[PDB]
């Protein structure tokens, strides 16, 4: 490069002039508690209520008396790492707590490293954490997690089990979704893990 | 509010919190009052402390933070005392509750999104 | 019918008498010959309930072979009671029965080093080292090259040690010693960091490496190597006492207080890390604590001997005394309650109980202690007896 | 809708100022990055690879506490001199680095400090009985101190909102300073009084970082825009969008196209300037992260921090994992390099600040 572009744009464009661009807004209800007593008067209150109206009813003489006697807003994105998606229960049961939690992503599997990226809500997240590291039992194999961050909105559609024996073709494929980094350090931390 | 009520949490934040106070003091695992939080903080068995920043004075409260930095608990201010004691199940207004940790109980999963959450308001 | 009749001889001995049970024992014995456990439980009821423990050895000797751990207690019979060159020759004739070098060449050279002539020593566990290598035998090796004096040939056996056993942290934590007691004190801090770096789980060689740290002035990188030896276990309790200690030692205390929060709050099933909590804790406060750690940590020696302390600090030595027995009662081979003992029976008391805790401490060796390992693993009190070592723990405190 | 407002005739003259200094700095940086561009890639990758070795066996050292109170930010001193730490207290020592030893703590605050950032000529060509250093605190205070007195100086009271980050410029006229009032003040050194009040975004900055020129400066907060204002006039062309999330941390490369910004979404924000683009979106930790700070004048890495125990030195470009500096016990909160590269401070939410050194 030659030269920068704000360089470029200033060199004679300096002058006292402050604004103020682009004002942008960033990408409610409260509940009431009540105590003992409050809930007592509550049902109190209803119980006289509903005994004034049978009693009204009763008058009236319409009936006999009764006888005596969000995914917007931040989406929460993880990405786990296994040594080998063999575990076809394990695997499936955490498969299917992400797609019965509503959640999408993709599961990239390679030698030795496989990939599964999930994105939902925070309480689905969460319970596919706690199924994929507690309750997924894998065994040399074993699942971390990788990452658990947030993002805008979701990546991909649905959780579909892709595979590719090259790291290039499952990279091309998370980059055409735009989650080539997620992959790629999922990768490192796997060659870090292995050469220490 | 008050500029020493550190960290300050948001609307939802406060509404959670209240649900996780209610759902603690109905399951007999908040302790309502600021002597009742300072204790359960000496005795390391209190999970979480929430302030409140409509007290007058809060220094009062102020040791309540501190003391979270002497047990590592996590501290939050509420928006008003009012709602704090609406929230613990009383008609007074509380000013410092101590939701404490139970021998497994079912609110240990909120109590710990509630204690992340809380973490991280205070940059 | 032979196990059903070693657990009525155990139930026996254990009940009202012990002739009843050596004569079963006898039977079950001259029944049919059994393996190594029936006469390890036949010289186990024989020491502790002279001759006929001598008697048992040599009928194990000649009536059960390949038995090195019965020929190492009877070999220990010998030379505590009989005679120590009776021993060493009823070692050397176990030696032709058992070609193997693992045990009997380790406690041949353990006889020969306890007593004088420590060049004949030298040659059985040059020999040793020549006929069955390991890292046991290479630490013994440095061990009685370095009790004697701080020689390069002991630094030149602890860098083979170092090159041949690099995984096992006892040669690094050896050669760290040794380098330690030399007048340079960076290379003990650089073969300390090699253990630690290569065992990569090392707790002792990291506690060494952190007080060689803070002992030697900076303790900034004392404090930082002390939170890698915790962050590299994960989370070990070891690492977050001596981190504890070590904000203890200086002024930070309320940095100490938030230290044990910290490691009881990652690990409240711990002993020593609940006495961290209660010696560090107030005066009043101290009821608490002890009755917390006693809640959390029900059945433990450690907070038994926290509680034994504490009840000794507030003028009650009817109750430490207590205390001291329940923990010795608990677990009698702990050697800082056996050393809190024996100062309780010091400080408070007649000679009986002082005489009661020394046979107490003669009887189970202690080990894995706090006061017990600062006098057990150096070099000048190496070959030294139980009752000298628990008179030693008991004074410096 | 961006609304011009004239300004007084001292902010067009320190803006002139800024860009007749930034000018020929920017063709010096031209120079260097076309004789660097004339190097063949052996030895540029030989010059890489023992970078990423030295960065690779980066051991943590000299973990000296601070006070009481946890450290929320760091800044190394200019040719590698001291490291100026702001704790949660109202002190703000220099320890001596790497000796690890405090000596002259400013103190003068009564709030929570925030980022005390030293000038970046403090101690090259700056005397210490001058203003060295400036501080900023939770109230409304940017309040400047020297490294022999232990007291503050004449403070600007432009600021009544939570002032969160301040940083000097490279020029050492200015110094920007990010406020929660939806605006960023740019106070002056010489004039002794605010030049400017850029706002571009609808909520309060926290992190402002100027170029390494002078030319641009960027910014960020909790709007979850960046913008990248230039000194000249204003206008700020590259804006920085993706995070969905809080901007805490800005930091810009030597590199006139690099620029880093740390959000609070878990990741990191590589964009660049020529084409006013994102280039990586690193996933540098799982927390938010707050701390980020770029390489010295070779620019070759990237330190950034997070709300975790950890804190990532990726490689500039490339995004990848070189080193986990990790060892701390809270939130690594303020983290700076030093002027040689050798060495890097990461002050953290446990009260103590080590340093990261190649073994």
Redesign the interface.
């Given at each position: 490069?030659?030269?920068?572009?704000?360089?470029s744009?200033?060199?004679f464009?300096?002058?006292?002039?402050?604004?103020?661009?682009?004002?942008?807004?960033?990408?409610?209800?409260?509940?009431?508690?009540?105590?003992?007593?409050?809930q007592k008067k509550l049902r109190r209150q209803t119980r006289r209520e509903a005994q004034k109206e049978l009693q009204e009813k009763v008058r009236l003489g319409l009936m006999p008396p009764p006888e005596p006697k969000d995914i917007s807003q931040?989406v929460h994105i993880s990405?786990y790492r296994v040594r080998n998606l063999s575990n076809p229960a394990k695997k499936f049961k955490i498969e299917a707590n992400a797609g019965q939690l509503y959640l999408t992503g993709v599961v990239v599997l390679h030698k030795d490293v496989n990939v599964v990226v999930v994105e939902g809500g925070?309480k689905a997240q969460?319970k596919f954490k706690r199924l994929m590291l507690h309750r997924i039992k894998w065994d040399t194999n074993k699942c971390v997690?990788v990452?658990?961050?947030?993002?805008?909105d979701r990546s991909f559609g649905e959780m579909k089990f892709k595979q590719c024996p090259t790291e290039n073709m499952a990279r091309e494929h998370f980059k055409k979704h735009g989650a080539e980094?997620?992959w790629?350090?999922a990768l490192?931390?796997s060659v870090?893990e292995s050469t220490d | 509010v008050n500029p020493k009520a550190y960290p300050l949490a948001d609307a939802h934040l406060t509404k959670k919190l209240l649900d996780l106070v209610q759902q603690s003091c109905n399951y007999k695992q908040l302790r309502k009052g600021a002597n009742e939080a300072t204790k359960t903080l000496n005795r390391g068995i209190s999970e979480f402390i929430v302030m409140a920043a409509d007290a007058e004075p809060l220094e009062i409260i102020l040791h309540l933070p501190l003391l979270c930095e002497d047990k590592n608990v996590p501290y939050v201010f509420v928006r008003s005392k009012q709602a704090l004691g609406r929230a613990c199940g009383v008609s007074r207004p509380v000013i410092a509750c101590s939701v404490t940790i139970k021998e497994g109980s079912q609110l240990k999963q909120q109590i710990q999104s509630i204690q992340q959450s809380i973490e991280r308001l205070l940059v | 019918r032979k196990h059903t009749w070693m657990e009525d001889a155990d139930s026996c001995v254990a009940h009202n008498a012990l002739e009843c049970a050596r004569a079963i024992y006898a039977y079950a014995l001259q029944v049919f010959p059994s393996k190594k456990s029936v006469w390890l439980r036949a010289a186990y009821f024989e020491k502790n309930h002279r001759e006929s423990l001598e008697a048992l050895l040599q009928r194990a000797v000649a009536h059960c072979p390949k038995a090195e751990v019965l020929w190492l207690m009877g070999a220990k019979s010998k030379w505590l009671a009989g005679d120590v060159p009776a021993a060493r020759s009823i070692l050397a004739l176990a030696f032709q029965a058992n070609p193997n070098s693992e045990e009997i060449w380790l406690a041949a050279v353990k006889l020969e080093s306890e007593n004088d002539e420590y060049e004949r020593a030298r040659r059985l566990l040059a020999k040793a080292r020549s006929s069955a290598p390991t890292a046991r035998v290479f630490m013994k090796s440095v061990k009685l090259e370095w009790v004697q004096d701080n020689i390069r040939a002991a630094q030149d056996l602890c860098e083979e040690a170092l090159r041949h056993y690099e995984d096992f942290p006892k040669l690094w934590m050896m050669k760290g010693q040794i380098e330690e007691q030399k007048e340079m004190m960076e290379k003990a801090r650089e073969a300390y960091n090699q253990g630690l770096k290569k065992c990569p789980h090392s707790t002792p060689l990291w506690l060494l490496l952190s007080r060689l740290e803070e002992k030697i002035g900076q303790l900034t990188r004392a404090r930082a190597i002390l939170e890698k030896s915790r962050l590299k276990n994960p989370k070990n309790p070891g690492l977050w006492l001596e981190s504890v200690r070590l904000e203890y030692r200086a002024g930070l205390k309320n940095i100490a207080n938030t230290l044990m929060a910290k490691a009881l709050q990652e690990c409240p099933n711990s002993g020593i890390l609940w006495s961290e909590a209660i010696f560090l804790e107030a005066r009043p406060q101290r009821r608490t604590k002890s009755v917390d750690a006693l809640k959390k940590c029900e059945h433990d020696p450690h907070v038994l001997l926290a509680v034994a302390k504490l009840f000794w600090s507030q003028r009650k030595i009817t109750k430490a005394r207590e205390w001291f027995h329940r923990t010795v009662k608990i677990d009698s081979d702990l050697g800082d309650a056996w050393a809190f003992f024996y100062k309780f029976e010091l400080q408070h008391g007649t000679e009986e109980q002082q005489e009661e805790v020394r046979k107490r401490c003669e009887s189970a060796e202690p080990r894995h202690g706090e006061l017990w390992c600062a006098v057990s693993k150096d070099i000048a009190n190496w070959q030294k007896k139980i009752g000298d070592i628990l008179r030693l723990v008991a004074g410096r405190i | 809708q961006t609304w011009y407002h004239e300004g007084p005739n001292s902010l067009k003259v320190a803006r002139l100022w800024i860009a007749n200094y930034s000018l020929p700095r920017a063709m010096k940086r031209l120079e260097e990055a076309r004789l660097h561009k004339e190097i063949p890639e052996t030895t540029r990758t030989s010059q890489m690879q023992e970078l990423h070795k030295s960065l690779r066996s980066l051991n943590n050292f000299c973990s000296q506490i601070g006070d009481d109170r946890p450290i929320s930010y760091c800044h190394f001193s200019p040719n590698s001199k001291m490291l100026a730490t702001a704790c949660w207290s109202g002190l703000c020592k220099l320890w001596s680095v790497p000796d690890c030893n405090l000596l002259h703590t400013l103190r003068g605050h009564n709030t929570n400090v925030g980022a005390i950032v030293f000038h970046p000529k403090s101690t090259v060509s700056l005397d210490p009985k001058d203003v060295n250093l400036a501080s900023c605190a939770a109230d409304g205070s940017v309040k400047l101190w020297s490294l022999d007195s232990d007291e503050p100086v004449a403070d600007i009271e432009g600021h009544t909102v939570r002032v969160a980050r301040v940083m000097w410029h490279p020029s050492g006229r200015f110094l920007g300073t990010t406020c929660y009032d939806r605006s960023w003040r740019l106070w002056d050194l010489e004039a002794q009084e605010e030049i400017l009040h850029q706002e571009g975004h609808s909520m309060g900055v926290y992190d402002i970082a100027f170029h390494q020129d002078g030319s641009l400066a960027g910014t960020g907060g909790l709007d979850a825009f960046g913008r990248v204002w230039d000194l000249r006039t204003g206008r700020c062309i590259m804006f920085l969008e993706g995070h969905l999330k809080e901007i805490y941390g800005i930091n810009f490369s030597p590199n006139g196209y690099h620029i880093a910004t740390g959000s609070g979404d878990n990741t990191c924000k590589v964009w660049d300037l020529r084409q006013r683009r994102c280039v990586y979106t690193i996933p540098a930790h799982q927390n938010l992260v707050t701390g980020v700070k770029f390489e010295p004048i070779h620019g070759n890495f990237l330190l950034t921090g997070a709300y975790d125990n950890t804190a990532k030195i990726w490689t500039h470009p490339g995004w990848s994992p070189l080193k986990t500096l990790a060892g701390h016990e809270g939130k690594v909160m303020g983290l700076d390099i030093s002027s040689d590269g050798q060495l890097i401070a990461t002050c953290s939410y446990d009260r103590t600040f080590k340093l990261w050194m190649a073994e």
């Open positions: 490069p030659e030269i920068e572009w704000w360089d744009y200033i060199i464009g300096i002058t006292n002039l402050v604004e103020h661009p682009a004002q942008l807004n960033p990408p409610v209800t409260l509940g009431v508690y009540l105590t003992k007593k409050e931040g990405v925070p969460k997690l990452w658990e961050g947030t993002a805008k980094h997620y790629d350090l490192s931390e870090l | - | - | -």
